[PDB]
């Protein structure tokens, strides 16, 4: 939701489990070519910036899916960002 | 159809899968040179503006083809725009 | 032949063994610089689009060579596309 | 079949016998280079993701072969996923 | 502030962490299209010149935000330029 | 409104997001040919002068639309001009 | 020779190796500035039209050099055009 | 805590019991795939650098867990670093 | 000085670092609009001709600044022209 | 200091312990993203060139830090280069 | 010297060690921005053409430096070209 | 010789002893960086393609050296390819 827009710069610089999020978003939010494009980036911040480059087309439901995936992956990161 | 004329400004700024639409429209609505010209643009809004520059010569059927490609590619963007 | 023009959009999105086709087409249909340019692309659809960008110069024999290479590489993809 | 497309995320994170599947699929579905590429990955999820990267070119028969190999190798994993 | 106007030539040629500054300025001083246009440039001086092309519209507060981002990113470059 | 006539010279020299304004005014205040004519200019001041050349035919509502587009695009430029 | 004048429209639309022809013609038929001007065009048809814009000043020998470069680069395109 | 950030370079080069720390952190700070990736490294400094690669997402509690595991495993190393 | 008026034709055809000179002369001899106009030219000779088009309004000091920038940028070109 | 600028080409081609230098420069001279970018390069000369790409922003103190790290890591290389 | 102008087309198409030449020419013939611009090209012929684009400003000494670097890098290419 | 050009596609796909050839060619035809770049590839066909990427700069003597190394390493492969 609005969480990933409010904490965009911190999420790019601190998310370390990106392949899990990609697997969670594959098929329903991400097409195969976007998945490949994200996976082809060198480093974690590069992958996160590439993933954020697709967000303008998303509605609230896709962002909620990403937030739920983040909660399942890094529960401590979300609590740190909220706090 | 009239959908791409009513939501032109939002479609230019929010469509992120342009190569898929170009592949869908190739041969039927786009020629090879127009395809190359669109692909030569730097950013996604530039590509969308270049593609929209060809629309004055389209009839209802070509716009329907573009709308069907958009529904297949970004189903959430079309629903967000309609809603 | 006309097969690669009739199934262009499906071939860009589904071919996964591109280096084998590049090796097969090297020297007779592809020059060294075009080979390097195709290899420089990040993902498989990007490589396929780059390879297709050279096809306007080809005659029927070059397209037949590409089709034979595809049949030797992915026999199931060609049969799936034909059916 | 559609089983490996429905349970992709769970199959990536839970399959522990990848070499057996590779030997089962060698020659019929996987070429030698793809076999080497899959075997060159560090971890089991990396190998599974690399193997899944080749699936867009497969038809129903190749996926059925993979599912039969999975049933022969992990019979409890398939039953867990089905229920 | 006036600092980025006084040291424009040295800032174009010596800033090497541009993506961090772009993330810092995104959403407040830069729109999405301007962010994409800056990120589409080949080299660091090209990115810096593209970013400086937007400065005529900025007031003092935007330049202060850029200067604070620079201090957080390259503390040694700012001190070297001041000294 | 009269704002764009009072600050004409400063608006020509300082507006850096012209394509967004063109998209906002398209269809309602600008025709297609005028849109292309404005987009064909090399530099930002040239584009702004070309856009201003059409203003003698506008009423208060068109200028209000341009002002609202400016407020949405560069809120800091409008505040700097007013201050 | 007269070949490039009789097949001008098809040569503009089907030549895909333009940099090789430019390197072949450099120094003898093209000056440095003309080479830069041709190379600065976005797409292949644009490059070929820019190159053809210089031909009114050529004699038979320059066109023969261009035809020899074409045969060395694309033997199948020339054979297709002749056939 | 800040202890593992203050002594990062010394902890990379001197920790010799990495499997014990991995077992201590498994499930609560480390997922299965990250555990596998760390275990797949050749040497102890390589494993420690891979483990440190995941740290940017951690909060104070995760670092405290790592420090407590270090105290239980190497009491002499922590005392040597503190002095 | 008179050096750039004596060697105008050779300077137009041989200077290859134009953006550096533009940055050096920005603010002091060139305005923002003139900088944009020079930068918008396609090739290096076109950029140098556009830059030379502004020289009729320059005094000795501006030409001295340009000559000093040339010596800092291309020391071998100036020595070759003098020799 | 000016040592790493005087012996840049020899330092790129002869430094074999790059991870130690990266650990020594982490935090105070290198940010996390730059650290990852350097570590993501294939070979030692590639890593050295990537590290040198960040040097334009450094002052004398950062270069002195790098030189001291080099002295601690390779004492024979520095003595060979000086002699 | 005149060698690199006489064998320009063969040198663009056959030089495979470009980064060594760039390191050899850095700081004396190439500035940092030109080094970055050459380094940002995709393929070896693209890098060679980008490097050759800077040659109009060079005198005999710079070309001799490039020739000496080529002889040290590829001794067999120079001998093959000479014969 | 021309042997490694007549059998390029079979040599890429069938050579299994690449380190021996690299050791044989080190110093005389391969520089240290090229040796590292070839050794950094994942699979045998990747290593062979990387090695072939350096071939355009070789003369007949270098190719003869590679052929002699192949004959010493694989005698059955050369005999199979010849017949």
Curated annotation (Swiss-Prot), chains A, B, C, D, E, F, G, H, I, J, K, L:
Tissues showing expression: Widely expressed at low levels. Detected in peripheral blood leukocytes, lung, small intestine, spleen, thymus, colon and at lower levels in placenta, liver and kidney. Very low expression in skeletal muscle, heart and brain. Expressed in lung epithelial cells (at protein level). Detected in the leukemia cell lines HL-60 and U-937, but not in Jurkat T-cell lymphoma and Daudi Burkitt's lymphoma. Detected in the melanoma cell line WM35, but not in WM793. Not detected in HeLa cervical carcinoma cells and MOLT-4 lymphocytic leukemia cells.
Induction: In macrophages, up-regulated by endocannabinoid anandamide/AEA.
Subcellular compartments: Cytoplasm; Inflammasome; Endoplasmic reticulum; Mitochondrion
Domain of life: Eukaryota
Entry comment on modification after translation: Phosphorylated.
Substitution effect: residue 63 to R: Loss of inflammasome activation activity
Function: Functions as a key mediator in apoptosis and inflammation. Promotes caspase-mediated apoptosis involving predominantly caspase-8 and also caspase-9 in a probable cell type-specific manner. Involved in activation of the mitochondrial apoptotic pathway, promotes caspase-8-dependent proteolytic maturation of BID independently of FADD in certain cell types and also mediates mitochondrial translocation of BAX and activates BAX-dependent apoptosis coupled to activation of caspase-9, -2 and -3.
Assembly behavior: Self-associates; enforced oligomerization induces apoptosis, NF-kappa-B regulation and interleukin-1 beta secretion. Homooligomers can form disk-like particles of approximately 12 nm diameter and approximately 1 nm height. Next to isoform 1, also isoform 2 and isoform 3 may be involved in oligomerization leading to functional regulation. Component of several inflammasomes containing one pattern recognition receptor/sensor, such as NLRP1, NLRP2, NLRP3, NLRP6, NLRC4, AIM2, MEFV or NOD2, and probably NLRC4, NLRP12 or IFI16.
Other remarks on this protein: In breast tumorigenesis, methylation-mediated silencing may affect genes and proteins that act as positive mediators of cell death.
Entry note about domains: The CARD domain mediates interaction with CASP1 and NLRC4.
Protein name: Apoptosis-associated speck-like protein containing a CARD
Gene: PYCARD
């Amino acid at each position: 939701l609005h969480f990933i827009d409010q904490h965009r710069a911190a999420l790019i610089a601190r998310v370390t489990n990106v392949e899990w999020l990609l697997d969670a978003l594959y098929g329903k939010v991400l097409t195969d070519e976007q998945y490949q494009a994200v996976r082809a980036e060198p480093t974690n911040p590069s992958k996160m910036r590439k993933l954020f480059s697709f967000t303008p087309a998303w509605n609230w439901t896709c962002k909620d899916l990403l937030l739920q995936a983040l909660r399942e992956s890094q529960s401590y990161l979300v609590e740190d960002l909220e706090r």
